[PDB]
Design a protein around this ligand. Structure first.
Ligand code: CLA
Ligand code: CLA
Ligand code: CLA
Ligand code: CLA
Ligand code: CLA
Ligand code: CLA
Ligand code: CLA
Ligand code: CLA
Ligand SMILES: CC1=C(/C=C/C(C)=C/C=C/C(C)=C/C=C/C=C(C)/C=C/C=C(C)/C=C/C2=C(C)CCCC2(C)C)C(C)(C)CCC1
Ligand SMILES: CC1=C(/C=C/C(C)=C/C=C/C(C)=C/C=C/C=C(C)/C=C/C=C(C)/C=C/C2=C(C)CCCC2(C)C)C(C)(C)CCC1
Ligand SMILES: CC1=C(C/C=C(\C)CCC[C@H](C)CCC[C@H](C)CCCC(C)C)C(=O)c2ccccc2C1=O
Lengths: 80, 95, 29, 733, 151, 39, 63, 195
């Protein structure tokens, strides 16, 4: 599977979560930012690595990062 | 014509004399300032078993510590200078 | 010309067949 | 890993075809394999080097064996001017009768290929005379091959496995390589020239069974130890000496004559012997510099650590470089490849102008082949040097341990370096293209007198200082009253000045405006290629567009369409882009060399001198002309021995364009197409019974770039090789 | 002469080129009525041609074995017009352009919307900064010594 | 009218007029001082 | 920390405006906020963003 | 007292050193250790020049020789040298080369072993039999005199070498006489703005 990481520069705008086409990310409670929330990646086995999340992130630099790793039938987006 | 034996022996003598008396302290000092090592520890501490400094061979009962190695070194310089002089004086070069 | 008629088809046809079959089985295992 | 590749379970768990490809493509990148350590790394590299050596020895033995078995080496040594050297016989059952008839060249009794590697001139020059010699040498090199394989296997075994510490013993390896590998080898080769080559050229058959019974010098070994070395240079070969014969032969074994042996038009064997001897001495003396196990010698770490200029304009100087080099094999490979590339180009440049092989340089196709060969090899080697450069910067470089040294400071002002390379390339491009296009327009409008033709005053001045009298600058070696001229007037200057002013050879060819222009094209090529490579190296760790690039490695597809788009952002991609510019640059240099030399050998340098000033001239008078015979290798009327090169010419064009396919069209299109094909297969009866074990997918982005570049390069090389050989050998100058 | 070249006024091939050129032009001229426009055109080409060769000869140009003017850029004082002088002129004009552009970019740097005046040129401002380039060496030299050139 | 002037001051129009003027200049200069290879 | 409207230099290495200057908009007083210093910049980044949050050790008040 | 009136002298040059006139445009003595070494080496160059200059002029006037023609006896198979007109027996290139090498190497390396920075430039002791350095103030004054005469000697040496480059084969005194011939016609002009 691919690897997805969240860093504490996250401001919890939730943009990345609603950008993922395979339901990989989600928002969890946190106290480090005003929005009282931070991103999380509990389902990277379904991650394809399209990087829409990274394109949705406002922070500089990114608070969500996708490191393409071991390649599986799910990550290759195969339907056969 | 120059005697090869006289030139070589005199040259080697001058070199060995220079190494034994006039340049000995300086050489020993600079050597004291330098020793090969990788990541802090030496090559033998790392350690390569074939990189240990020979303690036995370097031993000498000479007053200052002039050993076989220094003899080979300054001797080498001596022979080099000698054969340089010989070969040079042998040619018929004219500028 | 004698040996080439033996070695050329050997290296050009037999060898790559053996090698490709072997590598195929190896990679598929 | 439970399946191929065994060195990576990450790839092994791939259900697709990718698994195979990447398996093949990462097989030699030991650092990224599973459960690897520094030890396994160095040991595998060592064994791999032994393997490479074995392959080299086997290759050479193959060449020797085939020349001896199927060639005309003896017929060649009897008449080197009028015999085409046979590389090997050919047995192709696809041949028709005209093909069989056409390819029967030389004194062969069947189809053959003519060698353009120039092994004949080499082997003949060094002392080989018969097929038997070649066979024995082949057997010996085969023996060396077996020995090398045995050594790899041996040093892989637990008893003979060297430790990492041993590999990191730099001082010892430097001492031994400088004194032994460089020194002793060169001394021993001088030994071969004195004992075998020189007597062989004088008509004396000296082999193993008698070399102890023959004196290499009339009063041998005496003068060496006596210091009367001059006696070894007493009477050199005469100016009317015939190679391989006693006629005109002298007795000297070590000289500095300079120039060429008039018959063979190559360097004197005594000159080469004296050369190898001398450099052997410099190496041997220089090989006693570093400290080992004897209490004397230098410490490289201390030397580096001491070279920091007070005032701090270079920061901490070279402090810490010893470790960061000795720990990073990639840094070492970068330095190695850089130096090797430089000296490979040096080999080309010196071998075309100062040939050392008897009756080469008369062989025009061989010379062209050699130059092009070594210049392309040099190019690739250079790009590789600059490729292992940034791999170091990513995988190995430790910022903290390199604090404020020359390397860290190098990364500091990277923008300055890159921007100035950019300026240089930009300037050279604008003005060289501009001047060319100007001249072309002038030729078009029928006014070539309005051309801007800048004379290469500087290079011509250098030539004059070297003793060429065509431009009449009268400087240094061209000035009769110059102390530099008087200094060696009675040594090498006779032969040398005789050679540099003999305008039928390639020793400092005469140059005009065309040479100026194309030289600035070459400058453009070098500067631009280094722009790509250097920029790729310095931004390998990160940039403002991707500050954490180092966390992704040397090679990755991209970083995504976000932030404006990040295609070709990896250092690997920088390399990949740089390869095109290297191919272009070497293209220009080989074009230059080949055209100038073809016009030289044809007897009309005015052709080059007038036509090279405008690009229509290169296109029409170089490319279009010299393909006449090539494209006529086969036609509706018949075929000849050039059909191979025509077929290979087209082959190259085709492969090149396929390269264009992989380079222009990208992945998604093909992936979806393949999806429709997968559906197609699962819904086709009878064929349904057959199913794949590895899911079919489109090649990866990076994989696509690599395969595309490979087709491109292969097409490039093969096309130009076919043109070179066909155009040159079709007329032989 | 320099680089083994021969002066164009003394070059035979130079003259032969002029000859063949003029003769080609005349060979084309033979087909047209002398008073017609094509005739006047071709004749204008002939006069321009010979004036060109004559001027090149007069300028002290050196010709190769090709019969074409080659240029000497080593700094040789007999050929400063062959690179040095037009080079100085170029540098002057280019410096002018660059300095004016720099002035314009600096002038609008401190504004509400700077990019605006980069896509829609402030012609009054541009005309004010236009002639300042005439003294660009003096202006830049002083800014160099002052520290207003770089940051 | 002010808007039209603003349009005339836009980058492509400014460039067309500027390079048009330059083209005219260089053309006339090369007509009066033709075949210049020196100076 | 620095005042509102204060000109600060960026010390975060991976920032688009690294080694450059921006203006302080507001500082979060919540001590749990890891990056309180809100900064706005004259030029947008590659993501068309003109504002970013930084920590106290990532800004340097200069003039 | 500085070398350029009105020009501020460097921070590390207070004028407490003999010959300290605040001349260092390139700021080479900005590093103290380097500056000390430069003092030593300047004195060495000075003393060598002060020995060289009269050794160039004297044998040209008296010995009717030339400091450049006195070099030419070597570089040829003959290799015979003369001193005060008298041909020296051991005066051959290799011999005097070996002697010079050994002697100068010994004395220079012996100078190299000194650690005290003040004695590395002002050794004294055996090198001061007249004890002219016993009085501190007189030592300082004589130091200033030494560095000044030395620098002037260096400048003279530069003069000799450049004048030799311009007029090869002719000595400095010969050039002085040539200048005395037509001072308004025989000058550096013929070399600078000539011809
Ligand atoms: C490089 C090695 C190599 C060699 C030695 C050959 C040899 C041959 N090929 Mg070629 N071929 C090759 C590679 C090679 N090919 C490649 C890479 C391609 C694709 C570019 C081709 C495409 C090709 C085509 C389209 C044709 C050939 C043909 C031929 C035959 C020449 C025509 C003829 O008159 O023979 C006389 C041939 C016969 C009298 C019949 C041959 C019967 C064979 C020998 C029986 C072998 C049986 C045995 C089980 C084979 C198993 C081998 C396997 C286990 C390794 C000859 C045997 C022609 C051919 O095959 O004719 C039938 C032909 O039409 N080849
Ligand atoms: C480097 C490889 C090499 C080897 C293996 C040889 C071997 C030989 N040479 Mg050759 N030779 C060589 C290079 C070599 N030479 C070179 C570079 C030159 C040009 C100067 C010559 C010129 C030459 C002449 C003129 C002669 C030889 C002769 C010989 C033979 C007699 C050896 C002897 O008795 O020396 C003396 C034995 C010694 C042990 C003293 C030498 C020790 C050396 C100086 C130090 C070695 C370093 C040490 C191992 C550490 C022997 C087969 C003689 C002969 O008769 O050939 C058949 C002969 O007359 N050689
Ligand atoms: C001293 C020689 C040398 C050595 C020991 C290495 C070693 C290495 N290189 Mg380096 N490099 C070198 C020179 C060298 N290189 C040169 C000359 C270049 C310029 C081309 C490069 C450019 C380069 C790049 C861009 C990369 C490396 C990488 C590597 C590492 C992995 C190699 C691998 O597994 O490939 C696997 C082997 C293959 C994929 C097969 C290679 C065959 C190629 C594709 C051409 C084949 C076409 C064929 C000839 C066509 C047939 C023609 C016929 C049909 C007519 C390994 C450490 C890689 C790395 O790991 O970096 C971190 C990497 O990405 N190298
Ligand atoms: C023949 C095709 C071609 C040409 C002309 C170029 C030209 C250039 N490439 Mg290269 N490139 C090419 C193919 C080509 N490339 C290929 C196949 C690849 C592999 C992908 C690359 C990959 C590559 C890389 C990685 C890099 C370059 C760079 C460059 C620039 C190098 C600096 C220079 O010489 O400036 C001189 C300028 C030119 C030669 C361009 C011509 C400008 C014209 C003559 C001026 C305008 C004329 C006229 C007024 C226009 C009227 C048009 C009208 C519609 C208005 C130069 C613009 C480098 C770069 O950008 O450095 C700054 C760089 O890093 N290229
Ligand atoms: C000149 C180089 C070249 C070649 C050979 C191809 C070939 C192909 N392209 Mg194209 N392509 C190219 C340039 C090229 N392209 C470029 C520059 C671009 C960028 C615009 C593209 C973009 C592109 C697109 C968008 C598409 C293609 C498609 C295709 C395939 C069409 C189907 C077909 O005709 O198969 C037949 C194969 C050939 C005609 C190639 C030659 C076959 C040889 C002669 C057979 C040799 C025999 C044997 C295999 C030899 C083996 C020897 C070995 C074992 C030693 C075909 C493989 C299409 C596709 O995939 O449709 C199915 C498609 O949609 N390509
Ligand atoms: C390749 C490097 C190179 C460079 C950078 C130069 C640069 C120069 N050359 Mg030189 N030249 C060169 C190679 C070079 N040349 C070669 C290989 C030859 C053939 C031998 C010449 C033959 C040549 C001649 C005959 C003359 C020059 C002159 C000049 C100067 C132009 C006038 C000037 O600067 O104004 C004013 C000059 C100065 C401010 C000082 C320049 C002179 C000092 C000593 C340097 C300029 C410094 C001219 C010159 O030096 O005029 C004074 C000149 O007359 N060049
Ligand atoms: C835009 C720049 C420009 C400049 C500085 C000039 C300058 C000049 N032109 Mg004009 N000319 C121009 C553009 C320009 N022209 C254009 C765009 C046209 C086409 C309408 C002309 C058509 C033209 C004609 C027909 C004539 C001139 C003439 C002249 C000269 C009159 C004195 C003067 C040098 C006169 C001249 O001196 O011709 C020899 C003249 O008869 N020009
Ligand atoms: C990029 C390099 C380059 C250089 C250095 C040149 C230089 C030249 N070209 Mg060429 N040209 C080039 C590229 C270049 N061109 C290209 C890329 C093309 C294809 C479009 C051409 C097509 C071309 C043609 C068709 C002609 C030229 C001509 C000329 C000459 C014109 C002299 C002149 O304008 O009077 C002097 C100009 C000035 C003094 C302008 C400055 C005026 C300002 C107002 C001065 C201000 C001072 C205050 C000059 C030597 C002409 C020629 O006669 O060739 C010998 C000519 O007929 N060029
Ligand atoms: C005991 C004693 C003594 C004595 C001592 C002595 C005397 C010693 C000697 C020693 C010696 C006597 C040594 C020697 C050595 C030598 C050497 C070490 C050599 C080397 C060589 C070389 C290195 C060579 C090289 C070469 C070659 C081989 C070739 C040719 C050229 C050349 C030269 C390069 C005394 C009394 C003092 C005191 C105490 C006791
Ligand atoms: C990226 C990287 C890298 C790499 C780099 C490179 C690859 C580079 C290249 C480089 C190069 C490629 C260089 C070159 C150089 C060259 C030179 C430096 C030369 C010199 C020469 C000379 C010095 C000569 C002289 C002379 C003459 C001219 C004539 C006469 C003789 C004589 C000798 C005098 C490394 C790994 C490091 C690390 C970091 C990263
Ligand atoms: C044509 C094309 C394909 C389709 C190509 C495919 C699927 C490869 C099919 C190759 C067949 C299976 C074998 C071809 C024959 C080769 C010569 C086999 C060589 C094997 C080596 C080990 C020798 C892509 O997948 C692709 C992906 C990304 C960018 C561009 C492209 C692209 O251009």
């Amino acid at each position: 599977s691919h690897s997805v990481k969240i860093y504490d520069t996250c401001i919890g705008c939730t943009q990345c979560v609603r950008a993922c086409p395979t339901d990989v990310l989600e928002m969890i409670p946190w106290g480090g930012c005003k929005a009282k929330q931070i991103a999380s990646a509990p389902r990277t086995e379904d991650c394809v690595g399209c990087k829409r999340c990274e394109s949705a992130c406002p922070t500089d630099f990114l608070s969500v990062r996708v490191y393409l790793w071991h390649e599986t039938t799910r990550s290759m987006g195969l339907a056969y | 014509e120059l005697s090869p034996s006289l030139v070589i022996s005199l040259s080697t003598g001058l070199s060995l004399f220079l190494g034994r008396f006039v340049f000995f302290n300086f050489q020993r000092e600079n050597v004291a300032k330098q020793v090969p090592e990788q990541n802090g520890l030496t090559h033998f501490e790392a350690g390569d078993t074939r990189a240990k400094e020979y303690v036995s061979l370097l031993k000498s009962n000479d007053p200052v510590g002039f050993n076989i190695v220094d003899v080979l070194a300054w001797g080498s310089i001596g022979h080099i200078v000698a054969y340089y002089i010989l070969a040079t004086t042998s040619n018929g070069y004219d500028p | 010309i004698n040996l080439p008629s033996l070695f050329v088809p050997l290296v050009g046809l037999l060898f790559p067949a053996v090698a490709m079959a072997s590598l195929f089985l190896h990679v598929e295992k | 890993a439970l399946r191929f590749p065994r060195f990576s379970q990450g790839i092994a768990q791939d259900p697709t075809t990718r698994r195979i490809w990447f398996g093949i493509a990462t097989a030699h990148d030991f650092e990224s394999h599973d459960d690897i350590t520094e030890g396994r790394l160095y040991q595998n590299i060592f064994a791999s080097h032994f393997g490479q050596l074995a392959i080299i020895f086997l290759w050479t033995s193959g060449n020797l064996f085939h020349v001896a078995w199927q060639g005309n080496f003896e017929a060649w040594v009897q008449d080197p001017f009028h015999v085409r050297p046979i590389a090997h016989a050919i047995w192709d059952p696809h041949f028709g009768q005209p093909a069989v008839e056409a390819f029967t060249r030389g004194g062969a009794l069947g189809p053959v290929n003519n060698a353009y590697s120039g092994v004949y001139q080499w082997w003949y020059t060094i002392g080989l005379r018969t097929n038997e010699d070649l066979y024995t040498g082949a057997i010996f090199l085969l023996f060396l091959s077996f020995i090398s394989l045995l050594a790899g296997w041996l040093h892989l075994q637990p008893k003979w496995k060297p430790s990492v510490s041993w590999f990191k013993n730099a001082e010892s390896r430097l001492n031994h390589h400088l004194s032994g590998l460089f020194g002793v080898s060169s001394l021993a080769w001088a030994g071969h020239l004195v004992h075998v080559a020189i007597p062989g050229s004088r008509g004396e058959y000296v082999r193993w069974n008698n070399f102890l019974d023959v004196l290499p010098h009339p009063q041998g070994l005496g003068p060496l130890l006596t210091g009367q070395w001059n006696l070894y240079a007493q009477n050199p070969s005469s100016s009317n000496h015939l190679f391989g014969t006693t006629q005109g032969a002298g007795t000297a074994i070590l000289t500095i004559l300079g120039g060429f042996h008039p018959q063979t038009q190559s360097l004197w064997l005594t000159d080469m012997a004296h050369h190898h001897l001398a450099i052997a001495f410099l190496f041997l003396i220089g090989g006693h510099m570093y400290r080992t196990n004897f209490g004397i010698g230098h410490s490289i770490k201390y030397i580096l650590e001491a070279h920091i200029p007070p005032g701090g304009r270079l920061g901490r100087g070279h402090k810490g470089l010893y470790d960061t080099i000795n720990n990073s094999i990639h840094f070492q490979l970068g330095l190695a490849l850089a130096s090797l590339g430089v000296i490979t180009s040096l080999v080309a440049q010196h071998m075309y102008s100062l040939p050392a092989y008897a009756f080469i340089a008369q062989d025009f196709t061989t010379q062209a082949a050699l130059y092009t060969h070594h210049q392309y090899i040099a190019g690739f080697i250079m790009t590789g040097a600059f490729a292992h450069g940034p791999i170091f910067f990513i995988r190995d470089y430790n910022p903290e341990q390199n604090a404020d040294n020359v390397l860290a400071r190098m990364l500091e002002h990277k923008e300055a370096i890159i921007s100035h390379l950019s300026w240089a390339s930009l300037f050279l491009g604008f003005h060289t293209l501009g001047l060319y296009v100007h001249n072309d327009v002038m030729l078009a409008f029928g006014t070539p007198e309005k051309q801007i033709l800048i004379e290469p005053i500087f290079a011509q001045w250098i030539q004059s200082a070297h003793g060429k009298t065509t431009y009449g600058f009268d400087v240094l070696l061209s000035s009769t009253n110059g102390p530099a001229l008087n200094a060696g007037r009675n040594i090498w200057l006779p032969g040398w000045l005789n050679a540099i002013n003999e305008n039928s050879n390639s020793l400092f060819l005469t140059i005009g405006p065309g040479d100026f222009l194309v030289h600035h094209a070459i400058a453009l090529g070098l500067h631009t290629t280094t722009l790509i490579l250097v920029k790729g190296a310095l931004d390998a760790r990160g940039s403002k567009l991707m500050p954490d690039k180092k966390d992704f490695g040397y090679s990755f597809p991209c970083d995504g369409p976000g932030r404006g788009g990040t295609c070709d952002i990896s250092a690997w991609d920088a390399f990949y882009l740089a390869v095109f510019w290297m191919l272009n640059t070497i293209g220009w240099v080989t074009f230059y060399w080949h055209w100038k030399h073809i016009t030289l050998w044809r007897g009309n340098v005015s052709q080059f001198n007038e036509s090279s000033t405008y690009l229509m001239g290169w296109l029409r008078d170089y490319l279009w002309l010299n393909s006449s015979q090539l494209i006529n290798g086969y036609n509706p009327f018949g075929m000849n021995s050039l059909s191979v090169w025509a077929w290979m010419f087209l082959f190259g064009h085709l492969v090149w364009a396929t390269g264009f396919m992989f380079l222009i069209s990208w992945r998604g299109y093909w992936q979806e197409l393949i999806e429709t094909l997968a559906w197609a297969h699962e819904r086709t009866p009878l064929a349904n019974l057959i199913r794949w074990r590895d899911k079919p997918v489109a090649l990866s982005i990076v994989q696509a770039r690599l395969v595309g570049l490979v087709h491109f390069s292969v097409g490039y090389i093969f096309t130009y090789a076919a043109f070179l050989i066909a155009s040159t050998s079709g007329k032989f100058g | 002469d320099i680089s083994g070249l021969t002066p164009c006024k003394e070059s035979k091939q130079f003259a032969k080129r002029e000859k063949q050129a003029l003769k080609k032009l005349q060979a084309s001229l033979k087909l047209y009525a002398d008073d017609s426009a094509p005739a006047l055109a071709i004749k204008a080409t002939m006069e321009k041609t010979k004036k060109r060769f004559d001027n090149y000869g007069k300028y002290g140009l050196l010709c190769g074995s090709d019969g074409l003017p080659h240029l000497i850029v080593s700094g040789d004082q007999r050929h400063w017009g062959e690179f040095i002088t037009p080079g100085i002129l170029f540098l002057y004009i280019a410096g002018w352009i660059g300095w004016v552009g720099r002035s314009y970019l600096i002038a609008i740097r401190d504004e509400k919307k700077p990019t605006q005046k980069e896509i829609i040129i402030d012609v009054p401002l541009a005309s004010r900064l236009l002639f300042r380039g005439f003294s660009w060496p003096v202006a830049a030299y002083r800014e160099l010594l002052n520290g207003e050139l770089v940051d | 009218m002010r808007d039209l002037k603003t349009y005339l001051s836009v980058a492509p129009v400014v460039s067309t007029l500027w390079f048009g003027a330059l083209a005219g200049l260089l053309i006339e200069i090369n007509r009066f001082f033709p075949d210049a290879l020196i100076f | 920390g620095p005042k509102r409207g204060a000109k600060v230099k960026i010390l975060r290495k991976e920032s688009y405006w690294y080694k450059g200057t921006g203006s302080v908009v507001a500082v979060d007083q919540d001590p749990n906020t890891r990056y309180p210093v809100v900064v706005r910049f004259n030029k947008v980044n590659y993501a068309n963003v003109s504002t970013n949050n930084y920590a106290l050790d990532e800004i340097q008040e200069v003039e | 007292a500085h070398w350029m009136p009105g020009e501020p002298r460097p921070a590390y040059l207070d004028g407490s050193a003999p010959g300290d006139f605040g001349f260092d445009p390139l700021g080479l003595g900005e590093v103290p250790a380097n500056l000390e070494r430069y003092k030593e080496s300047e004195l060495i160059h000075c003393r060598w020049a002060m020995l060289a200059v009269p050794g160039i002029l004297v044998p040209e006037a008296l010995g009717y020789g030339n400091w450049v023609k006195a070099q030419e006896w070597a570089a040829l198979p003959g290799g015979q040298a003369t001193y005060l007109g008298n041909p020296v027996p051991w005066g051959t290139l290799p011999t005097i080369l070996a002697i010079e090498f050994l002697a100068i190497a010994f004395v220079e390396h012996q100078r190299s072993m000194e650690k005290d920075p003040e004695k590395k430039k002002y050794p004294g002791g055996a090198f001061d039999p007249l004890g002219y350095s016993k009085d501190p103030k007189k030592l300082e004054e004589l130091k200033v005199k030494e560095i000044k005469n030395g620098r002037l000697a260096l400048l003279a040496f530069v003069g000799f070498c450049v004048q030799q480059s311009a007029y090869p084969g002719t000595g400095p005194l010969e050039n002085l006489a040539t200048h005395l011939a037509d001072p308004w016609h025989n000058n550096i002009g013929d070399i600078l703005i000539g011809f």
